Amino acid sequence: LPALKLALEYIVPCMNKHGICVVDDFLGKETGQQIGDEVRALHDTGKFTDGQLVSQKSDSSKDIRGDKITWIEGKEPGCETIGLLMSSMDDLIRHCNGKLGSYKINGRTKAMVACYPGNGTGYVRHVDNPNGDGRCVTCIYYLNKDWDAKVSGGILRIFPEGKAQFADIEPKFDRLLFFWSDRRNPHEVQPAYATRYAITVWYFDADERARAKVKGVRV
Numbered sequence: 001l002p003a004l005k006l007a008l009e010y011i012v013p014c015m016n017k018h019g020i021c022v023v024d025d026f027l028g029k030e031t032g033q034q035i036g037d038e039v040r041a042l043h044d045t046g047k048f049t050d051g052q053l054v055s056q057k058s059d060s061s062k063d064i065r066g067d068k069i070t071w072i073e074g075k076e077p078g079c080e081t082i083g084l085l086m087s088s089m090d091d092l093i094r095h096c097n098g099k100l101g102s103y104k105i106n107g108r109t110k111a112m113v114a115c116y117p118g119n120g121t122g123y124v125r126h127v128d129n130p131n132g133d134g135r136c137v138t139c140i141y142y143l144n145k146d147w148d149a150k151v152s153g154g155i156l157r158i159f160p161e162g163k164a165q166f167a168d169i170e171p172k173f174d175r176l177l178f179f180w181s182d183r184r185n186p187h188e189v190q191p192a193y194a195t196r197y198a199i200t201v202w203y204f205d206a207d208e209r210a211r212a213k214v215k216g217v218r219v
């Protein structure tokens with residue numbers, strides 16, 4: 001699918017109606033697998049953090065850690081298919097622009113690659129941007145070949161604002177997800193019992209980000 005046709009016929013309508021949009025088979029199997037390989041090489045070569053401190057015990061070799069992260073710009077050696085993913089997200093957003101709510105998207109973060117290590121940890125209920133920091137759209141790409149949540153857990157559960165209620169989204173290979181980053185979409189990651197990778201970029205609305213700057217920037 002040309003990025004523009006996906007954007008106009010699918011992303012924009014779904015985002016405006018539901019605030020959440022799932023695109024399956026985004027990049028296809030060859031590119032998805034190449035991204036998988038890049039992320040696994042990052043993991044195998046020690047490029048992730050040790051993971052979010054989940055249980056701090058006053059004895060510390062028994063601390064439990066959860067999601068590990070690394071920030072990727074997309075031009076690093078061995079990360080160029082991740083770079084390519086990021087470009088493809090950006091092209092999708094560029095084709096939506098002016099049509100997602102009333103936002104005008106003018107920038108994004110680096111990619112945050114996350115690895116839930118498969119030790120029963122997940123991620124607590126949260127809103128990505130609860131305090132007006134500029135981020136308007138969360139974009140997540142999942143990496144996980146043959147993921148079965150009934151065995152491996154790791155479902156993303158989102159609670160669209162005032163609804164009875166939730167949507168359960170499997171972290172499926174080659175699935176791309178968008179959702180509004182603000183309090184409209186509280187969400188959580190259920191415990192994962194197998195290694196679970198995802199790559200997230202957040203897009204900034206120009207007006208929100210400009211006044212967030214207000215609330216060394218000193219001349």
Ligand SMILES: O=C(O)CNC(=O)c1nc(Cl)c2ccccc2c1O
Binds near residue numbers: 069114123126
């Ligand atoms: O991975 C998923 O399906 C959903 N993940 C998250 O919502 C998520 N959100 C945030 Cl804000 C962080 C923030 C830091 C590290 C990992 C995160 C994460 O997995």
Ligand SMILES: [Fe+2]
Binds near residue numbers: 126127187
């Ligand atoms: Fe989140």
